[model samples]
Target: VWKDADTTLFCASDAKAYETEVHNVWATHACVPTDPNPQEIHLENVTENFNMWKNNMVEQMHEDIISLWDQSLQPCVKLTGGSVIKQACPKISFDPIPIHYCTPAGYVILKCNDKNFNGTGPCKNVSSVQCTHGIKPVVSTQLLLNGSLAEEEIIIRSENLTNNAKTIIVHLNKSVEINCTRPSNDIRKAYCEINGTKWNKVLKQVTEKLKEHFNNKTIIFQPPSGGDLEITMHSFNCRGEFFYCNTTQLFNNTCKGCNGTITLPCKIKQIINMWQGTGQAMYAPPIDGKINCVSNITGILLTRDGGANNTSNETFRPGGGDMRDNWRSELYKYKVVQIE
Candidate 1:
């Protein structure tokens, strides 16, 4: 991830402290140049007459020099084409280069290297995401030696993946494996309704049974129906992992934290419902219908007569296909609010 060409560097005004660090057994930010007052270290001149101890300007500004090459390629490319791009005399603000929204998949890059040891991860952006069959996902806020919450680390604890699905961290960036396309219309679903109850007793029955027989594992109970409640005794904080809902869609923006460390993506989003929230979210591409409960002839099916149509021809159509199941309400979705 480099280029052989040179670009002008604005060196740190204060170098004595950084210079001293390079000799230590394990130097900290010593190799890092703390900037502001500019010193020009041309890769051409003083760098040519090299002695590791006597001439080490290139060594100190290593991170900054790397940024000039990789962080954005435009500025240097223009310099090579003979176009004079004016230096800000100021750098990229707070240098805004790292509001840090680095990818559409929403990965943030750099903290210690770019932001002067800011000592935390980027604002969490994986908001209000859900999985199939009403399964919910959670972010890991578990503490680390860094004493920072895991979301500060972007380590989303997904029920679907069970192994702590995540993305964009210093040592390793992993993918959140939430998938499998299912039609919302085909899955025949049933519920144990009666929203409020001494039905609490019924809930306890399922919970106790699940603990005795189903802990850390899943099974199709009754070959008919079961839980909106069960304590599987899993090692993680969520309840839906064993139920396995593979696909999901967001209901609203993710929840916010005490301090606002969030980035929003808008495509019709009007709400930034933070994840302090719960499984108030959904999954599957919906079948168009009028809301709540059901209706007569809720859907119509059409099939053309030509086998499985990949349809390079309309003469052959999706005269084909197939995909069902029961799931209880997520325990995380249970709570008492002002029930007025």
Candidate 2:
């Protein structure tokens, strides 16, 4: 929302030509002394009055007009000012105080007056004013309208906030919903193994499923043991309005033109091994350990006493409270990239 006080330039009422360069013109009122009242004009005498008026008007209009235009027609070239207007000079000869030649600078203060043909009279500048052309940068809202192709936009908001389930709707038909978080108090770690032919009770799955009843396609495995959860869907060439299926709490289920299938793979051991190794190194042990795959000891916990007594208490206590189910969190992020 722009305020009305936002500065604007005044232009001739007849100047209808909308030129980008016109915003630079500034007007100023410089008059020829007809009454010969001023001491400066009186000394010149009547014989030199015409010449003096011409010279005076030219001199005053020249400098004042330039200054006015400089302040107003900013971002524009210097305009021709001064009593230099050959067209206006002739009319001023019959009526020394020609309204047509009267220029006013500063903020436009012209009003209807009987003296100037009962129309707007000589303009005056009482306050600072600014002029701006309407030309603006073109916004390319349609540049990347195609949703079926890969593109990126800033995410504004998300809905369906639930610990057990969550969903995020993107600009396009792209939607992601994952309920991968473990039960509130479940102890067993959940692993989403992708491409696994069957669920391995001892080892949890952590990768997206590539094979399933649907077909050989991208499939995300959700571990029942529960953990941090996230889901993201990538739409291809899908554009237009996308609605959330709040009733189902799923993404794109009710949106028009939404078509995609999730599948699981026959094997997921290799991907799981790679992900776990990398996950352990990045997150550090104790915080993350072998999930699904049992071990003699669960290893060290990353967070203890709700992060209390942490080495960098001022910053973040390392092991205080219960460590988040990082395994599930990692899987959620992993699948997101895999689908992409």
Candidate 3:
């Protein structure tokens, strides 16, 4: 009965069956089967089944088309100089959206539009297709010593390519101390020279000697009265170690003298003053179990006033001379004392 069927008759029933078989094959290939039956045999309700299966086939075909376009067309489209596309034929009406594909090699994002086919057309690569070959914002460090050329140290590198005029801040492994000296009969007239710059009196007053942490130190000066000046720099060697103390709590207790010894592995280089009191009594270090006290008199006294004299003085009494018995000469006495 199936073999002798005419073309239109076959189309009506056998064709539907053939189409259903083809759709089944395609769905099996696409891993999206429309029919539950693994082995299809008879064609019952050919029209109804045809309509349902046809819709399924059409939908799968649309998906396949879109997948093919994304896999083939997007990679072939070249964005030459920059990430932006120079031209896109068949001009789209709406703005293109980006589609990203993460691959083992790198990342590729295609700017595409599919407004013409009701979101079914080939999303052609339009302008602004970005291809990120590698990561970015490479960090590097450069040590710029006193008047010396910069030495570069790479902290992180995203790519092999080099970037120009990129600025990055890197802390020194240590601190830097620069000293410039000049000799003259009068040391005050001498000036220090550093990197061809002359630094004089006010510069000496304004420039600080030591910096607390990692920072650049600069010194400039000139030779004194037909003499040569020497410039030297002392760079600190830091081993990525630091010590922190709660200063407010550390020195909270008042000590009359050095009663205890703090044994530390590291030597104390400097002591910074956080607070001080205005006291006239000076306390010295303990020597032989006794802390000596010295008067810290800051000024001198010029003249002695009546208020300054705290003691009383008595003057000599006027003695009775020779005729004391007959003339009866009286005696006089005087006493002087401070008023206030």
Candidate 4:
């Protein structure tokens, strides 16, 4: 149902569960203005504006982290709590079970909210679903191996996450493939993958009052021959689409700046080196709904580090879905591995 036809019923059936969380998030962010030609509209343009507005709203969530730290009974945020949240996006669809009569059964819903409220028989229950309202966002890390969730799950929430940032190394199976989806955000940028050759740049910072005078400004970063050892930024929204580097950037190093030998608040480097193994990415979570997500230990991740190096500056923005979430009071499970 495209808003094209009075009803905007977005449904994708296969293996999985009814995604109330998706309805919770997407519905509020969607803008289906009833395009004249629904087939031509991917909501790409129509909903394009909506995505940015959504991003802006979530940006402020990170500020609370520092706020909580200053007023904390626990000074170290890493001392405890860090489970990545996500929705239950089923990889394999289940056959017909006449399930829609009682509830939803696909990925998302982008308009109004309501009970299944169908006609006749089991569908006649005015309140056909147990789906709830006003959900809070969660913190999640989703590791995708190939196109499926790795069967093994390592729950690393509520532990000292800082330690994992510098220690864990993800070893992928030997199959390198680059599958890039064209940017839906109006950029020519495409995401890719290959193998690994780590680059690390630790900056003590550079002063630019006239250090040397070959005078052709070029920024340089001589790293530890390595990696994001710093955990400076993170978020708590169930949203993520990490930008990865392509083959062309592997050895091509250039710099950017405010003006310096290195530059202030500026990073000068190309981030692409490797996908290393099979197509695996460390993205934060979403739709970990129904608690159906599980992953492999030697596999995928939630990395926010700069691709130019092995830094774990990339933090997980979580999702909201599990047994039953409480109002501001929720406990979760998941592990954080420091990428090497």
Candidate 5:
């Protein structure tokens, strides 16, 4: 019940008295004070109003792509087993023009391991087929049970490092596996400079001497382009594995070098006309107990790529909600679309 407080003045007119009485009843139910001072209800309403705005303004398009890829699209052929993928397009057919009469509609280039298939087998190679504009294939491609390569192996991992050196040397032995990461401990030495007389005099001269020390080995170098240096080297030498292991440990600065280990083996790549920019941002898998923050964003956005986890609905929950979450439901009841 409202504990109505005394007011400075009472306009004892019939309509004012009725309003006051109604206000008292409303306050009793709403749990608000009945004083004329209007105890803080508007402040609470304002908070709720902004919360609604936040919900409406937050975009979920990124999450929508993730959901579609997971629930519908199969992982790339290289990653999944002998499986088929399908799609549905609309049925908006149109007659061909006189010049282009009965011309075939070019089909999608279905590729596995980046190759066209044409053999009579479970994952047999097939030719491109023709279809109408809005008619998508029911089964785009199929995988076989004859122990073909899987989708997981086909996806390529590319690095986008800032100040990447101009030259990358990858020395791979036939029988060894290598894992490369940024700031490699095996990179005992690296050199770079902008394209100028000073660069040739200093950095180039240093490389010339270093080349003499590591004689008769293949040398790889890339000239700088677009004001950035880029270098990548993969060593296949069994002796280089120790240095490769050290390079992998530099990630997040968590691992340290051990005693009696040849740390920071020199790289035999040259970088020219390169300029180092702000360092590249590191990539990390999401941790179980913490959140990754975004800047200047209204709502959550989820990103995923084609890989083993691509077909699984692992990213369906955003903040523990449904896959098709519209975090703005508490706000307005309607949204208007102005289509072009």
Candidate 6:
């Protein structure tokens, strides 16, 4: 009930009198007079009355704002999987409903069941959303060499792979030339057989030798025209038994004394020239002929060939047969010694 207070200064039915009565009632409740002076009491009452009126006006404005929100905006509230809505009031609930709300200004709220919904609640001011089914397939390749897996393995572990998937080309060791065509091709089959010897091992040997020449200071030697030095030596070493015997023994015959007289074999010139020609084709330089010089004066005494005959030398007595025949005999002797 509205409280009535004194309004004797004006007529009972006057608007001014009514307003004064309402002010008096509020002042009676809100004002506290600390001084006995009439003027002080009047001033305190006026100040307190004004403050109470402002507080009441603010409270009413808040109630009106809340009413507008509930009646006009609350019903349109959307709660989606991606949204987060605070505690629901009696008239509004977002626990189970699956409705999505979108503002006319191009913003949308996601529903709880929507694929993009974050499962919390609706999101506001969202213009557009992108939905993905799953991750795309990733394709890759691997290289295998010398019966061993490469340092970087090439295996494709992926989902959603398609025929249109891009092809990944993988390269093998630079010493070994490898080529791969299909994604599923065995990397082993893609490798070419490296002949005459292990190029990497040969490089190490040559590098060590070069370093020794330089007083053991580290010396880097690159193969001429990037050709494999090991392969070059292997090819030259495979020409014939005499050539092989002479070249292979070029380094380690320290203990084996000259079987007879030490005269450079005449066939060596032909063999060395052939080797030089082959090296030119392969981008490798000619091997040192001085290191490879052999003596025919020994007349092919017990020359060891490859394979099971590696330990035994095929002997040839001077004038027993044609030198060419002896050379052929030695050539076929080591057919089993495979160098790759």
* Maximum-TM-score candidate: 4
**lDDT string, candidate 6, 32-102, tens digits:** 22222212011121111111111222232233223322332221123334553443322221111011111
| TM-score of model 6 vs. true structure | 0.13
Clashing pairs in 3: 192-221, 192-222, 193-221, 193-222, 194-221, 199-221
lDDT for 306 in candidate 6 is: 18
**TM-score on alpha carbons, each prediction:** 0.15, 0.13, 0.13, 0.18, 0.15, 0.13
1-340, model 4: which lDDT tens digit per residue? 2221111122111222344333222322331222222221122222201111112112222232223212221111121124322333232221111111011233222321112211011211111111212222223222222221112222122112244232111223222232333223213233333322211111111112111211423323222222321111111111222232222232224423322221112111122111211121222222222211121212222221234234322222212121011111111111011111
Clashes counted in candidate 2 amount to 44
Per-model CA lDDT versus the true structure: 0.19, 0.18, 0.18, 0.21, 0.19, 0.20
Clashes of each: 8, 44, 6, 47, 29, 16
Residue 289, candidate 6: C-alpha displacement in angstroms: 34
The C-alpha stretches of model 4 lying farther than 4 A from their native spots are: 1-215, 221-251, 254-340
Q: Against the true structure, what is every candidate's RMSD?
A: 27.6, 34.0, 45.5, 21.5, 30.6, 44.3
Which residue runs does candidate 6 get wrong by more than 4 Å? 1-192, 195-202, 225-340
Ten-residue segment with the worst summed lDDT in candidate 3? 326-335
lDDT score of model 3?
Answer: 0.18
* lDDT for residue 102 in candidate 2, whole number 0-100: 26
Against the true structure, candidate 2 reaches a TM-score of: 0.13
lDDT of 3 by residue, 82-135 (tens): 543322322111111111111121221222221121112233322221221111
